[model samples]
Target: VLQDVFLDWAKKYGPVVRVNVFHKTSVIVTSPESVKKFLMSTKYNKDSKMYRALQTVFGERLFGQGLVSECNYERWHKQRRVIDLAFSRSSLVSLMETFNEKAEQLVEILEAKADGQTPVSMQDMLTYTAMDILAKAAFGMETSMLLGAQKPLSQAVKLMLEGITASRNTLKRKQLREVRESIRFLRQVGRDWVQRRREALKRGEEVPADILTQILKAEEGAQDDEGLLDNFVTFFIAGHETSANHLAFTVMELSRQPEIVARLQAEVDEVIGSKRYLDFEDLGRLQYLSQVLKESLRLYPPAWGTFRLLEEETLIDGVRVPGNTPLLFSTYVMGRMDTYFEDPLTFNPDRFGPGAPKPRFTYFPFSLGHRSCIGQQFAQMEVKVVMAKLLQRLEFRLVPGQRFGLQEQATLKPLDPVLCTLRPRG
Candidate 1:
């Protein structure tokens, strides 16, 4: 959540700097050497307090807790096995159609927004589009519960992010007096969502092979019920927003650069012409599209940073931190650091090419170690399918001299609409 200034701190203060994050004391590290020491090594356990703190929101599932991205040991193994079974290579192939259909729908929305005059809010549209895609792929229904024309889920996610960012600048963003009311509102919203989904499920509905169903089964089989609330929060949080940002930024980048858009269009044109749309093979062929998304992630990673805590006094490359000390790392800074990248601020897709070796430990959009994001594959394919379809059918140009201001929070997003205009592709 604190990826922004945390990265800025690393840039300003070598690889490691001891600082205070709210009531917590932490070591903010950005150097490859220190990252290797603190994050990648075998000595570090994934089940630290920094991760455990998430139990408040993610329950024990820890972002589907026992998944490969967040768990180890037999639980992690079993969860991974379940995931593999659900998203079997062949099964994922079948799911490709779901993504492509959603992408085409996304393009249609952009098409209406393509007047080339008014600035289209890429952030807003992509948010809904991403939710729909995940909903379809995961639950067979898009949680289309829009509040005043926007999804309440999207608004709540924004509030959570704003809360985090606000906490950074001021004291704990929510004063104790207001916290109860705010949390009550948030909880009610969550309960409403769950109730709606449950109601739909009761009508002999198909429980799509989405993670929601996975969670239902996992909970049925699990022993501990203490951590249930945390898991539900994780499911809601982890389910959509990151992928939404990916769609937002990729389109933003493509709109910002016409040449890049044309190149991606060429790939889509050759791979999937009018006779066909994006299939697995078509998407698989668009290596440059993938690279563009990679570059977009490098430029604007949804998660700018992450936190971990030490269980005991430990020396990270001789820098001793006591138990409960929080350790922060910037995937944001590492990607943008001059040491790890040449012209770190520039947008360049060639960085991830066949011969172009990306610096190790510098890029971690999904994160590193065994605790990286499990939805990485789901997010990647969704992004590629969506972007490829949009560029193939649409040409875009950004509003004159527009800039996407960075929104601060648990995740990074466009504080301003990533305003752009879309037009049909030849």
Candidate 2:
């Protein structure tokens, strides 16, 4: 695949590597110095072709110039400010109950099937947990997916994402009428919700102040109802899917290594003895668990890399690059390289343990610099909340003889569903 070719080329060509894709050309920067020069600066704009392609899932423009796929620097800046408010520390703290509530729902589902005779797909459950949390905390709606309910919008999202995993084809685009219709339906739903919330605020009726409510109030300076819907789609995908993948991959790795699981459980027990719900302080105290999450991200970063489009000529590691070249960087390749990490293939959480030196520009699962994911803290906190609650309540053991590997779609996900058996733990 192209990734293998990129990996081999990075090894052979070293820091500054040039790649050609038919008529197009791009550069992949791997060195720490070049990464700092390129990624950390605000001069470059996000390359558009890739994002425009991602803008549409199946056929319709799903994110529709949303914050993630928006290439207009000024417009992106405006929406980003609004998005930052939604992910601010205060907002995240307020959403802690929603996180714990959804996590408890997941635990209840698992508890019902904790019998060793039945195998559960932890990855699937994590997906549901993430969906539930995103719905309540971000959308201010009760999806009730965690309680064995399904909605048309939910089913549409699954189909679109599943199709996006395969090859991008004209035929697929032509056949996306149903998916497109579902997204349009969701936009109408979002619009109605916003209108109702506005009327409620005017009447002095009690209403939840969710991320959706925050965005609706912040709709000034730019962004109409369509823009709001754009963000609704973007946050739904970003908030739920990426973190779900992270937790699933982390849990899979934990199940493989009992020693690490024991260490994590010990830390959880010390910090959260007899606690039903994890408070914000407990999230900070789970030091060993934090290391484990970091280590897993190194191996399976949901966002494998990011790209930039240069409008002016620049120098990368002494090599001159002309304007209009697309620059790519991959944490997936860099994290696995022996040149940067010692025993890169080995799963060692201590590499990120306390007192360990941070790898400069070499470890950015959430990307880095000006275009870094705005929801980094939110995603981390959500994963930690769910994982802590899960470890405290249940013991997960990976069913043996499964072929475990990474599958790259829009994001890198587990190749197979992480099937495991669970038993209640004290």
Candidate 3:
């Protein structure tokens, strides 16, 4: 983790420190006031070069001008407004049905495997469940990834992330070829789905007001197929992986703390006992579970950091920063700093308990302000449903001797698989 290195630097140097990587110079900022200034306003835009690298992976088009990679303010705002509709309060409440459906499907699959001996990869299991939920709720597609069916999109997403990691370092020619092929395959799927929905619209058929619908609506007159696919791939990648990682890390943390697991189990039993499907209201009542999830993110945020390009000179922490400099803000580094959190390395959910003092700008796992993640509520709701159901039905123990390190992929993920064994709760 480069961010951990940055954390070390932040501790040694002052709040605002400058670093030079060859010809490039950037400043690492940790002061809460500075985080507010840079992240709260649109005065600073996303670092074009950093996001441009994501716009294309391995010299092929990927996430090209999508919401995440879109640097232009006006265009990003337009897309954000239209996409906002799909994640509105009512829309999210309506999505609870799909969230419960997919989570229940996962419980069913785990029933046969909860023999207390088989090593289940929690990372893979949660990822499959997240993908299925996204496909049905957002895209109106059925991908029975948990049912052991062949899943092309899931495989493609995995390869694409590997491709990203490989591109950062190095890769063989054949591996690089496979990576490009997967990118093409994913984009083609987006094309097919977009065209199918358009045909349905032309025939005067009713379509669900899902994300795909919102995406098409965003480009109603423009009809830019490539741009549409850029967002399509963007949601697929963003919608699932980050949530899955959050859930996996939460489970990993819980497995080591018997007292915490017992406390969460108690909370789950009280709020959702014998409930087959979780309701929208049920999520609100799982108070301790919410704290657990928040604490998990503080420790292992899936998307670690974000960068902003300063177009004008600014004073941060009393230090002057020149224009055209890239300013870096890392949630991971800020979350772990002793100045912001006491016993920062320890996993304690009490930090987020009711009426607990909150970290203002030092704790934004989903970034902050206007450019924050569009699907924050959707992701958290889905994670809570899956977690609540799992706690209700089974008990798990981490398989010993596996690496519990963190890896920086497209998002931060467990370096090694989170292996666990499960049994029906007595």
Candidate 4:
């Protein structure tokens, strides 16, 4: 919401503007070219204070030394290289089974509620599905949540996010203790999985080459358990939940427009047919589905934008920025700006359809440049698998009289619970 206020400022003050955030003066750049200049290169480092807050706040080290929180340029580069191997396209190709298996599980979960009598929480379902997939694919654990059982990890993530939102010192220490304990629970899970995998490796036993194995095999010379733990928690925190939000928002958009759903379903049916499982190769044929996903990312990007710490004075749009200044760039604000998009307010997937002209720097949903999200392809493929399967089996409709909105915390999520009713479709 505060980003919207900065959008107004950008409109009034031209492409670059300055604003204050709690006694801190920060620069907001809306210029596509400027976004390109800074983001498309490694000239700027991530805002250290922002990430340091996550690393230090609330007792436990959150994202600590993870790829996202590692600020030292060389160290981050090394971690990125190692993490990239796990999320590589080839890796995702092999993991299609896990993705489809979890999606089908979700369909089974929803099948019983297909009576259209019960309003389903699309957010919760998608979130649980994504979480389960992350657990199995990345962490080597299966969750009860995937089998329709309650899991505390979900609630723990929710609570930690709330603690972040209520980021105040006066807040009860007991609450902070709970969040710290929750984080410990997740890290301990990671620690146990890593330990078991190592023991199995020593025994000359075969183990599935999921992310855990990939990470362990990646840097055996380094043998940094703390670093491995950082990535494990990173996968849980950064990996699944965002995809869940993407699917939820995409469903919300599809529910509003029957024509789009029909078109999407037609594409899914044509490419996937009645195949119980989808092949990785078939993803490229689902063209319109890609557009719909991009449009949703435009409207509701989870990673919206981030701040960077300027290492030295720089000129942005002829405005001088001093060293150590916090500069902000927003994909969410730029996504809705008329300067980059025609009729940006309208939910039009055609904007991203085939042959449509590309949007310049104004349209980066997953951040940009060297520091871009390494899991981009993996996330997109998972979304495609889940959404295609859902569209193929059911017709989704938003429950009447629900006011859908956005909630911003650790990530941007649907503010109102995305209540939807489903009907079985051929």
Candidate 5:
């Protein structure tokens, strides 16, 4: 099988394998140690176009009106510190009450669908849920997301996702088509929102403190809002979609094993009581729940894979990687590799437990090392806190035998509706 042909090829080639495609050299980083060189070592170096490819969109949109992904040195160091302050572990905990409130809203929405008897599309709801949480936590205020309209941003996000999936080149062109459709959709919905936000702000209104708002704060002193809009859209799409996909995938897997759900439910319920919210301290006690999130991410990381380029020829565990090589780290494929995990397909939360033994860098949903996502901590905090409140309010089981597919882009999500039939819980 699947493991031998696609995955084993990496072990045979070496931890880092270089490929020459149309005169373009690409390297794949398959192990933990090699990742140190590409992702961490000299992360601020000149070899970053693989990540800069994101600029096709980000160049026109985000990065607080600047892309550190393309630049390095002093600016990178300074901006990164600001980003770190904004998305630190402590900053994430600061938003627990906000996250908990959003989760409560989700449970109520699910409950109001006629006593939890209706089949709800977990995929859409997951997007809404994460969007609401990210909006609330990031800037220091609430937002209207997916609350109206079947989440208009879904079209744009879904299209971007459709572009890069399962390593298929066909998806790339298809993704552009989807993205075009989404942009048109954005012009209609997003443009109006921007106009209204401007009009309101003109009358001395304070915009909500979300990523977009925060970026606005950053761009105030920058030169022209040339590419900031695109970055804002990217952050919204990436931030919301990545977490949404993980939530649904984790829930899907959890639904398949009710016994595990009961155990997890116990942990969630024990930590969060009649209080509709949780403080930061409650996040630490829910260790098992954290494991469940880890296991889910291991299986379905947001960026199904990551890439980096090499400037100087380097050696990775005996393999010689030449300069200008593209190193691909398949966070998704490696997590599924049997060599890496015992019974990889089986959902085992304990694999991520306190006593679990894992080789270094084997698990990287948010990635590892310096270039790892700054918002990783924020994401982890929300998943745990939000899931806790959600479990306390409702119980759900996915409808069986349905083709709930994993739509692979940078992240994995349900192809259509990831349906879950619900029943109210105590």
Candidate 6:
């Protein structure tokens, strides 16, 4: 919603608009050249003040200097280099099996409810599926959240996400207590997993080279318990929630566009007709689906924007910004601008079709450059697999009277639940 407010100003004032929040002066930047210069270079760092809010929740460690919140370039680079191994091409390719399995599980769960009358909350279901996939693929933990089994880590994550949203606004006393408990439980789970893996190594027992293994290896010679747990919470929250929100938003968009749904269903029918499991190669062929997802992101990016701290005076689009200014780069605002996109309010996937001119730096849903999301490919692959399979087997119609608005809970989500009625595709 704040992004929309900023969009109003960006339209009235210009691309480079300065706004004062309390005592802090920050510039909302939409210029392509400015975005490229600030985001692409390592000289500018993440706004520590902005990210620090996420590093702790109500004075408790949540993200805690993790890769996402780490402002120190040297420390972040070290962690990024090590974590990069887990997201390498081979590592990602190997995860296709888990992606397929979890997505198939989602399809099975939806089958019983596809009766054409039952109201299904696609956002909640996709969130569970995303959590299950991240648990198994990244951490080697089996949490069948899609199967009606509620795990502690899953519940804690749910509460923590709610707590994050509440923290941003007003948090009640009881809610604060619950949030702290959830953080404690989550960190305990992280500690247990780390200890188990380390003991396995000490005992010479072979372990799967998963993301957890890579996380442990990231802090190998250093006994930084808090640091290890920082990444543990980071991957679980960042890696899963954003992808689930993206998928749910994509589904919401498709449900409203019958023609788009038909075209997407046709693509799925052609490339993966009646196939229960999707292969890695099938993902590349779902070009239209990819466009649909891209279009959805343009309209509803889960992580609204990213911030940068400019330590020196800079000239952006002929506008002078003073030293020590914090810059806001919002994809939600930029993507909706007619300057960057034609008929920006319209949902048109063809804009991203092959050979279409790319929208320079105006559209960065996953941020950009050095500090961009590391798990982007992982999230995209998981989303495509789930979406491809969903299109192949099910038909969805939105439940009437649901308000199609946006909510900024740590990440952006559909304000109203994406309630839909489902049935088997004819």
What are the Cα lDDT values of the candidates? 0.66, 0.80, 0.87, 0.81, 0.64, 0.88
Give candidate 5's TM-score: 0.83
Model 2 lDDT per residue over 1-426, tens place: 355577789889887788853235788888877777778887777888656666776566677787788887787887677667777778889888988898888988999999976898887888888988887788777778777786676776676675555424323456457666766776666677667777777999987556776666556656446677777778888888889899989988888788998888888889988688889888998888889999999988988888888778888888898988888888877888889999998999999977888988888899888789887888888888889888888898888865568877668788879899889994
Clashing residue pairs found in predicted model 1: 58-230, 58-231, 59-230, 59-231, 61-65, 62-65
Judging by TM-score, tell me the better candidate of 1 and 2. 2
lDDT of 1 by residue, 263-290 (tens): 7777777777764356677667889888
Model 4, position 95, has a per-residue lDDT of 85
Report RMSD (Å) for each prediction in the order shown. 4.2, 2.5, 1.6, 2.1, 4.0, 1.5
Candidate 6 residue 407 C-alpha distance from true site, Å? 0.4
Angstrom error at residue 124, model 4: 0.5
- TM-score, every prediction: 0.82, 0.92, 0.97, 0.94, 0.83, 0.97
Residue 280 in candidate 3, Cα distance off native in Å: 0.6
Per model, state how many residue pairs clash. 6, 0, 0, 0, 12, 0
Which residue segments of model 1 deviate by more than 4 Å?
1-4, 41-43, 46-84, 145-150, 164-169, 172-208, 221-230
Q: Against the correct fold, how does model 2 do in TM-score?
A: 0.92
Model 6 Cα lDDT, one tens digit per residue, 229-323: 99998987888999999998998888879999999998899998997888888899999999999999999999988889988788889888898
What shift in Å separates residue 19 of candidate 2 from its native position after superposition? 3.5
Candidate 5: tens digits of C-alpha lDDT, residues 1-426: 222233566757656556542134576577766655556765524345554544444222322224334445465555454545556556556677777788878877887773555788887788888887765565343455646645556556566554433223332456555565665564344445555667778999865445545455555675854444544555555666688888888777777778888888788768876677788888889888888888888876656656666567777778776776666777776787677788987878888778767646666777665656766767777787667866776787776655645654555565556687877785
**Alpha-carbon runs more than 4 Å astray in model 2:** 1-4, 20-25, 166-175, 221-224
RMSD of 3: 1.6
Backbone clashes, candidate 4: 0
Q: Which stretches of candidate 4 lie over 4 Å from their true place?
A: 21-24, 168-173, 217-224
